Amino acid sequence: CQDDFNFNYVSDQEIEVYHVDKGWSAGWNYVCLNDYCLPGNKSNGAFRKTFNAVLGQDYKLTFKVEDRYGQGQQILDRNITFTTQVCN
Amino acid sequence: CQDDFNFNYVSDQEIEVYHVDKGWSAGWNYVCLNDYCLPGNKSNGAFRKTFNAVLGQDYKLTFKVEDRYGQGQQILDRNITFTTQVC
Amino acid sequence: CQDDFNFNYVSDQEIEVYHVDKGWSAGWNYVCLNDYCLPGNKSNGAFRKTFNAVLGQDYKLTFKVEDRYGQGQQILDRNITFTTQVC
Amino acid sequence: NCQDDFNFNYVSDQEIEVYHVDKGWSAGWNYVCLNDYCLPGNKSNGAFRKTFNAVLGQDYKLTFKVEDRYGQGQQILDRNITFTTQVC
Amino acid sequence: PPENCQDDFNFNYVSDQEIEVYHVDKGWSAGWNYVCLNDYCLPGNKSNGAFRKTFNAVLGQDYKLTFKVEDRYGQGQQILDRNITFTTQVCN
Amino acid sequence: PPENCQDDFNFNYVSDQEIEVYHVDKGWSAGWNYVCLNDYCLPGNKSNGAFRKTFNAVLGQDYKLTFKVEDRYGQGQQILDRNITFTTQVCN
């Protein structure tokens, strides 16, 4: 649960994917589950979005963020198994 | 020169692109200039590689790196103007 | 010149790349020359940006644009030769 | 929601047709995709179309990729939808 | 081998809920490799002449297989994709 | 045929400002193909056993070659990259 890029169980059919805000300019941002991407909501120190998912399945998490005020970007991917953890 | 992702002047026709080592597992890594990619060498706290370049031109820097033992990765891009800066 | 995706000569070493506005939500947009990308400025009915270039070379133009208010995107590419054309 | 040129039809509760109205590209090749699973589109009744397995009520990324300018260009269009019973 | 097993880029049935995706070794330097199912990618294990990994899957569904491999001794790569329907074939 | 000309994915010197990039046919369905130099891509022409296209280049400069090809009869593709230095070799 200390990882900046992580997820919360919301229900057996819903996963919240998040990335803690590390200070990027973030003119735009997308949070994605298996490359299905939506704009992240910045709340309580993290960019977050909820998706439909199936407990016990494996997923690719992606965070894509605008950086350097027009001059860059970062894309971060991590694989997870969707469990009942609640971290943030 | 405090920026973790940056470049050093090598000569009028060469640029070193680097990213300070942030602790990724880094089973592979690539440093790129305008999407021409080579494996980075880890030296003095950073992943680094040298490319042909032209002083004064603009370039896209990329750093791509394995993390989480191959369960993840990070790709970082930034645009720079190649100057005589040495960090 | 009547093509919505095109360029203007600025100097022997400068090209303006533009895409006429086709109505996208366009929360973000990038104009690119050989995958070197910058945010486009929307002016006079087109998204535009100026880049260093070399008269007579061939370039890939790219226009990347946010669409559908968070729910989509479009990426358009075209190859050109940089000439003295002004549209 | 049937006006959009980039859209889908219900085929059955387990099958979705994804399509893009033909806008005149050279289209030496084209792909229609569902969640980045891609197949060559068939041009039929003014649109490039293909059918895929899907689950009613799930969210999907639609993609249309097409050649233009005789191989001197291309376009890739993405949009997110929820799979419903609409037939357009 | 039967026709559906000839191909160097292929899959084995493991169970009704598990698929093994593999690519026979073709000689790449292969400092790194990934095997993927619907763009969920894992580092491949090389065993008995092929790079391989097992995934969750549903018999009868369609999947994109991908194999990504390092090539040219630091100077390149190859990425291969092919679509399959997950069946009970067992090949390698 | 010397070492630098052996590989199926390679280049020919055409003149001091032109490089031909090619990939020898390896059997793909190949409904479409692209040959690229530094990610500037053109449809390849198939002639004499290889997919090939010419580009502007400068002797002694380093380039990324890419070959992209349709495969599996509508069901896949392959993308190959390699880095080279442009020299006066003539191979195919």
Side-chain angles (χ1 to χ4, degrees):
Chain A
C1 284
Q2 280 170 355
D3 209 302
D4 287 336
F5 187 13
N6 218 337
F7 71 89
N8 299 125
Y9 172 87
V10 173
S11 79
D12 293 341
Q13 296 82 25
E14 292 173 294
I15 191 178
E16 176 177 50
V17 178
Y18 64 85
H19 201 299
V20 171
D21 178 9
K22 308 302 298 197
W24 313 274
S25 59
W28 53 260
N29 83 88
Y30 293 89
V31 176
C32 322
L33 190 71
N34 289 352
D35 316 295
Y36 179 87
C37 298
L38 299 165
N41 292 134
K42 189 191 171 194
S43 69
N44 288 1
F47 292 91
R48 311 168 187 270
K49 182 60 58 171
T50 306
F51 300 84
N52 299 321
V54 176
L55 261 186
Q57 294 296 293
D58 299 331
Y59 295 95
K60 181 195 173 181
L61 310 185
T62 304
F63 186 56
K64 312 182 182 181
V65 64
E66 193 278 316
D67 195 32
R68 302 175 185 272
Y69 299 98
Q71 297 302 320
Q73 70 171 32
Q74 297 188 33
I75 303 187
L76 299 102
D77 294 321
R78 74 171 294 205
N79 294 344
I80 59 90
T81 298
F82 178 28
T83 63
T84 58
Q85 67 169 46
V86 167
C87 289
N88 186 333
Chain B
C1 285
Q2 295 159 295
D3 201 317
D4 287 339
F5 187 14
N6 217 339
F7 71 90
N8 296 312
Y9 171 88
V10 176
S11 77
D12 284 6
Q13 306 84 357
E14 298 163 286
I15 190 176
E16 175 176 80
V17 179
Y18 69 82
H19 200 299
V20 171
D21 183 11
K22 306 303 291 187
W24 312 272
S25 56
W28 58 260
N29 84 87
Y30 294 87
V31 180
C32 324
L33 190 76
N34 291 354
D35 313 295
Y36 179 87
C37 296
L38 305 167
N41 293 318
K42 184 185 283 180
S43 168
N44 288 153
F47 295 92
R48 27 193 111 235
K49 201 66 184 176
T50 299
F51 299 90
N52 300 324
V54 177
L55 196 66
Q57 289 299 115
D58 304 323
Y59 292 95
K60 179 189 175 188
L61 312 188
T62 306
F63 185 53
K64 313 184 184 179
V65 63
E66 192 217 59
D67 202 12
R68 305 174 188 275
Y69 310 121
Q71 298 299 325
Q73 68 174 193
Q74 190 162 351
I75 298 179
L76 298 104
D77 300 304
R78 75 172 291 207
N79 294 338
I80 63 79
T81 297
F82 173 30
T83 68
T84 52
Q85 138 197 317
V86 176
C87 295
Chain C
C1 288
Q2 67 288 289
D3 209 287
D4 290 333
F5 193 7
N6 221 333
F7 70 95
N8 295 311
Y9 171 93
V10 177
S11 74
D12 288 11
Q13 294 189 295
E14 304 165 283
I15 188 173
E16 179 183 66
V17 178
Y18 63 86
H19 199 302
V20 172
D21 184 12
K22 303 316 296 173
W24 310 276
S25 51
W28 56 262
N29 85 87
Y30 294 86
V31 178
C32 325
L33 190 73
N34 290 353
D35 313 298
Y36 178 85
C37 295
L38 298 169
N41 288 321
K42 186 181 162 162
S43 198
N44 286 122
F47 299 83
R48 55 217 321 143
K49 197 67 181 176
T50 296
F51 301 83
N52 303 320
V54 179
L55 201 62
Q57 294 298 110
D58 304 323
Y59 293 92
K60 177 191 179 187
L61 309 185
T62 304
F63 186 55
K64 311 191 183 173
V65 63
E66 192 279 314
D67 208 2
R68 305 173 186 272
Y69 302 93
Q71 302 297 320
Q73 71 165 211
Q74 291 193 29
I75 299 193
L76 305 95
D77 294 320
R78 77 169 294 203
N79 292 347
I80 63 85
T81 298
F82 179 31
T83 69
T84 48
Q85 138 209 313
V86 184
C87 299
Chain D
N1 292 354
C2 282
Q3 56 319 292
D4 206 299
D5 283 345
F6 187 14
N7 223 326
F8 65 95
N9 297 308
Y10 175 91
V11 175
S12 81
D13 66 337
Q14 305 185 312
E15 296 166 295
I16 188 178
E17 175 173 82
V18 176
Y19 69 87
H20 203 295
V21 175
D22 179 12
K23 306 307 287 197
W25 308 277
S26 61
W29 56 261
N30 84 89
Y31 290 87
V32 180
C33 324
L34 189 76
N35 289 354
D36 313 293
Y37 178 91
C38 299
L39 302 169
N42 189 32
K43 192 195 189 176
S44 166
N45 284 334
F48 294 93
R49 31 193 106 234
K50 259 280 145 165
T51 301
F52 302 84
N53 300 320
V55 176
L56 266 187
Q58 294 300 111
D59 309 320
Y60 294 95
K61 176 193 175 186
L62 313 184
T63 303
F64 183 59
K65 311 181 185 180
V66 64
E67 188 220 60
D68 202 8
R69 306 179 190 268
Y70 311 123
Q72 301 275 13
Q74 72 169 29
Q75 299 191 29
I76 298 179
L77 300 94
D78 299 311
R79 71 172 294 196
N80 293 341
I81 66 80
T82 299
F83 178 30
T84 69
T85 54
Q86 68 178 45
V87 176
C88 308
Chain E
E3 172 181 286
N4 55 113
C5 292
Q6 289 173 6
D7 214 290
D8 286 334
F9 188 14
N10 221 328
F11 69 90
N12 301 306
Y13 171 92
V14 174
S15 77
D16 287 354
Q17 298 128 99
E18 293 170 288
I19 189 178
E20 182 182 54
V21 178
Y22 68 86
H23 202 303
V24 174
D25 185 12
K26 307 303 302 196
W28 312 274
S29 50
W32 57 261
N33 79 95
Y34 292 85
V35 180
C36 323
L37 190 80
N38 286 357
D39 318 296
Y40 179 80
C41 297
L42 300 171
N45 290 316
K46 196 187 193 190
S47 190
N48 288 304
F51 300 91
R52 63 211 318 148
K53 200 71 182 167
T54 299
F55 301 85
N56 306 312
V58 177
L59 252 194
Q61 294 294 116
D62 302 330
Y63 293 95
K64 183 190 173 181
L65 312 184
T66 303
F67 183 61
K68 311 186 183 178
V69 65
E70 194 278 318
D71 206 7
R72 319 285 168 189
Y73 303 91
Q75 302 293 324
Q77 69 173 25
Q78 188 165 348
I79 299 181
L80 305 88
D81 301 304
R82 73 174 293 216
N83 294 162
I84 60 86
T85 298
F86 177 27
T87 66
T88 51
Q89 64 176 53
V90 179
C91 297
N92 190 321
Chain F
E3 173 176 271
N4 53 298
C5 290
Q6 286 174 3
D7 284 358
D8 286 332
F9 189 10
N10 218 147
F11 71 92
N12 297 308
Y13 168 94
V14 178
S15 70
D16 280 5
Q17 64 263 115
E18 280 197 342
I19 188 177
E20 176 179 62
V21 177
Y22 67 86
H23 203 302
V24 175
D25 186 13
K26 301 313 297 201
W28 314 275
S29 51
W32 57 264
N33 80 95
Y34 290 87
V35 180
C36 323
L37 190 74
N38 287 353
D39 318 296
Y40 176 87
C41 296
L42 303 167
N45 291 319
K46 196 190 189 188
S47 185
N48 284 296
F51 297 92
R52 57 196 92 219
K53 208 69 182 162
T54 302
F55 300 86
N56 300 316
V58 174
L59 284 164
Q61 293 293 122
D62 301 328
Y63 292 97
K64 177 190 175 183
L65 310 187
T66 303
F67 183 57
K68 317 186 182 179
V69 66
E70 193 280 316
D71 204 10
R72 319 272 173 181
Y73 302 94
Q75 299 295 321
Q77 62 173 190
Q78 294 192 35
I79 301 183
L80 301 89
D81 305 300
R82 75 174 292 213
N83 297 339
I84 63 84
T85 301
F86 180 37
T87 63
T88 58
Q89 66 176 45
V90 176
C91 298
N92 187 152

